[PDB]
Enzyme design. Structure first.
Site, PDB file in Angstrom:
ATOM      1  N   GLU A 117       4.162  -0.980  13.182  1.00 15.98           N
ATOM      2  CA  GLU A 117       4.562  -1.259  11.790  1.00 15.98           C
ATOM      3  C   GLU A 117       4.186  -0.082  10.910  1.00 15.98           C
ATOM      4  OE1 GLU A 117       4.336  -4.715   9.669  1.00 15.98           O
ATOM      5  OE2 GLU A 117       5.517  -5.672  11.274  1.00 15.98           O
ATOM      6  N   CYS A 176       2.231  -1.897   2.667  1.00 21.14           N
ATOM      7  CA  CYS A 176       3.566  -1.684   3.305  1.00 21.14           C
ATOM      8  C   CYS A 176       4.622  -2.577   2.625  1.00 21.14           C
ATOM      9  CB  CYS A 176       3.514  -2.067   4.808  1.00 21.14           C
ATOM     10  SG  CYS A 176       2.335  -1.161   5.847  1.00 21.14           S
TER      11      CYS A 176
END
Lengths: 468, 472
Positions: A227, A261
């Site tokens: 990720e 994120c």
């Protein structure tokens, strides 16, 4: 070596971590592998009892975990939420695991072949986790991997490593878990080395470093879950409820000082609402306080990593150099030794600017108008990332029509950044935001298991395809 | 200006060149990928039911020219009866995936733990999938990933091995009568270099072949930052316990070891037998092996086709020689020989074998049956697991529970129980490869189609007051 660790509030070095030489790291991994067989043989119910015992020990020492994490991140409110989220994930995974790990049996379409299935864990999973949400992000993959029957070696960021101490103290109460959940301290180099010892690597971080992990995992021939960040856009259509939209997007853009994120980093607003929107957004942004001089004083914590303060500073300068207008905040400043930036709203922006293309990881809200939906969809897709997005409209149906054209895994509808707050929703990252599937449910725990099929001949005559 | 590269293609029965293919240069390949991408939007927007109709139209066209497909695949492989099965298996696979796809692609809507947040899910195909497929079952292995990817809504570029490319011409002829498919299923010809080039243009790569090439495909895919599905061969063991039914075990292991002349990832390549039944077993194996005939001089004359690739003939020959040098005893077959210009090897049973020999450790891809005794189950399990592969295995015993006890100890994705190589005949049972045999999940079942889709979650705020976590 050792590595001196900076405090993000005071700017002083106030902690030391000791990165293992290759030989020690190899030894810790082998110990975890020796212990993994018994961990696996405990069965999922025994592993649940064990993780609950660890959870009870963490709760007992919660004040120590809170203090360490405040020192790591320079903030309190989100620290409490991280801890709550971590503890809840323990309970939620423990409640799902029995059913997810159930073996199955069935007859096939060939009358004399029956099928049984089992699930075999990767013996040792490596986790390389980031500094922005040190606890939740070191544990998000660790917990389901452990419940699957894996041993896990966790290497949190050198930037934020203090939170491990109380987790280790809590493990001193739980002998079964303490041999299979291993914490290692170090920098990027320790991360690269770890990939050589494990069967499966989970990495969360920058796109540049993640692409290295991908290439290393492939050369070792192990699976990798990655990720790698986001440049999540919000789209605000004409029919949007602007009062909810400005509150949602402010929250989504500046929670954790935008160090996420999942932060909203780009905002696109229908031309006929642009002025009203950004004016309202500023009004709301102005109310937020820096947590300075004291942690209690405000929602907005310091920029945790020095390197990130420089990136945020750079994005702002690049934006202004190219004509952007700063309406509020807009200054990376030193206070009490720490680096800070206030919620910042900018307009007169476009895609030639770093702040609209490269991950900023700051409390920055660049707002661009659009003349029509096709342009909005084009601008939102004009990115190398594809983690999440948000679409606001007068109705759910017209927001969804747009959301379906966005190249992103999780889209919030009439809200923003919902995946920061909730666990539900299976999602795959698009573009460079990641690879390796999803974390939720069956697919998220089963990442850590190999499926085996047993195909069983149940009769005693020749198979029709044999030569005889 | 520049010369158009061409590749001459050997006929495996005659040894002569009887076919030419023309690989596209990087510039032309990129162009064809971009054409498929443009057509992919309409293919995705057709919906799964429209895509099913189209695939069935393609199936009908192929069936209308079945003899031409059979003739090209006989030419590629040198054999008939396994050609008929490949074709039947391909056709059933189109049906099976058409059946499964609607349920796998359906959106869902659900509540969440928060009463004012609703969840919808959908699935978005990778726009362009590259498939690189091997020469040993050219039709089925070119199509095993292609078909579910197409139904998912992907366009697919398929690059079969230059060693066996002729089966494409009749597929392509059928394809061009189906207007909705013919710009999203693209066949390209070439060798390894064309395969490498294709990986630069796609969103997803499926590769089946050798471990060394697959490792290179893993590394290339990672540098491009795309998913790779890899299936890289096997050294599948069979374990025969003392209680086994030897009559069934010897027929099953023979079939598993020599079907397609042993040219299969799923071929049984190592055989471990309880020492008290060892002698009896190998004698029965020999008698059955000895009954099999080469498909020489005519394709009708026997079940065992030629070794399709010359390089594989060299490898098999080397394994037999290395084995003999190290003490192996050949009971039958044991010779790679030229006949009518083709290379051939008969079913070969060998004993006095061990893991110092190549034939017991490196992939052979030939019709070789090395048989070793074991004194106890613990040793049988140790030997079966002494490999860098982990694709499949077989265990035979007097009862399913006895076999399963042993099978659960093996590091392989699919274990056949009281039978061998069942994954060659059946497509049920999700399995992940172990060790170097593969990565990327399962091509079987649900997950075999879902790998080609990205899941998207929509989290929907259905009320009008502030979320409690906002700064309001």
């Amino acid at each position: 070596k050792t590595i001196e660790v900076r405090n993000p509030r005071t700017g002083k070095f106030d902690y030391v971590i000791i990165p293992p030489p290759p030989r020690l790291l190899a030894q810790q991994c082998n110990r975890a592998r020796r212990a993994q067989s018994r961990w696996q043989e405990l069965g999922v119910e025994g592993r649940i009892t064990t993780l609950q015992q660890w959870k009870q020990a963490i709760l007992s020492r919660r004040e120590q975990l809170t203090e360490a994490l405040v020192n790591d991140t320079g903030r309190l409110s989100i620290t409490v939420l991280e801890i709550d989220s971590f503890l809840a994930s323990i309970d939620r995974w423990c409640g799902l695991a029995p059913e997810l790990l159930q073996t199955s049996a069935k007859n096939t379409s060939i009358p004399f072949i029956a099928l049984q299935q089992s699930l075999v864990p990767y013996p040792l999973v490596g986790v390389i986790s980031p500094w922005n949400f040190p606890l939740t992000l070191s544990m998000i993959d660790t917990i389901p991997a452990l419940l699957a029957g894996c041993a896990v070696v966790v290497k949190p960021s050198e930037i934020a490593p203090r939170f491990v101490a109380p987790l280790l103290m809590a493990l001193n109460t739980v002998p079964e878990l303490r041999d299979v959940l291993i914490f290692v301290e170090g920098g990027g180099e320790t991360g690269a080395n770890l990939i050589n010892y494990v069967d499966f690597v989970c990495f969360t971080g920058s796109v540049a470093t993640g692409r290295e992990v991908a290439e290393t995992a492939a050369r070792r021939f192990i699976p990798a879950y990655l990720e790698l960040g986001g440049k999540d856009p919000a789209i605000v259509l004409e029919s949007a409820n602007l009062e909810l939209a400005t509150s949602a997007i402010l929250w989504g853009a500046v929670v954790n000082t935008g160090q996420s994120c999942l932060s909203i980093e780009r905002i696109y607003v229908a031309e006929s609402k642009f002025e009203e929107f950004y004016h309202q957004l500023i009004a709301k942004a102005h109310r937020l306080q820096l947590a300075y001089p004291l942690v209690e004083d405000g929602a907005i914590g310091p920029i945790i990593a020095e390197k990130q303060a420089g990136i945020i500073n750079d994005h702002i300068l690049d934006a202004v150099e190219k004509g952007a207008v700063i309406h509020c905040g807009g200054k990376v400043e030193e206070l009490g030794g720490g680096w800070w930036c206030r919620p910042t709203v900018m307009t007169n922006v476009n895609h030639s600017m770093k702040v609209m293309t490269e991950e900023t990881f700051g409390p920055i809200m660049p707002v661009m108008p659009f003349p029509d939906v096709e342009e909005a969809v084009y601008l939102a897709n004009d990115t190398i990332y594809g983690l999440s997005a948000a679409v606001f409209a007068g109705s759910e149906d017209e927001a969804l029509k747009v959301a379906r054209q966005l190249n992103a895994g999780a889209i919030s509808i009439n809200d923003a950044a919902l995946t920061a707050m909730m666990h539900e929703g299976e999602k795959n990252a698009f573009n460079f935001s990641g690879l390796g599937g999803s974390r939720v449910g069956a697919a998220g725990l089963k990442r850590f298991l190999r499926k085996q099929a047993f195909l069983i001949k149940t009769n005693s005559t020749s198979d029709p395809w044999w030569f005889d």
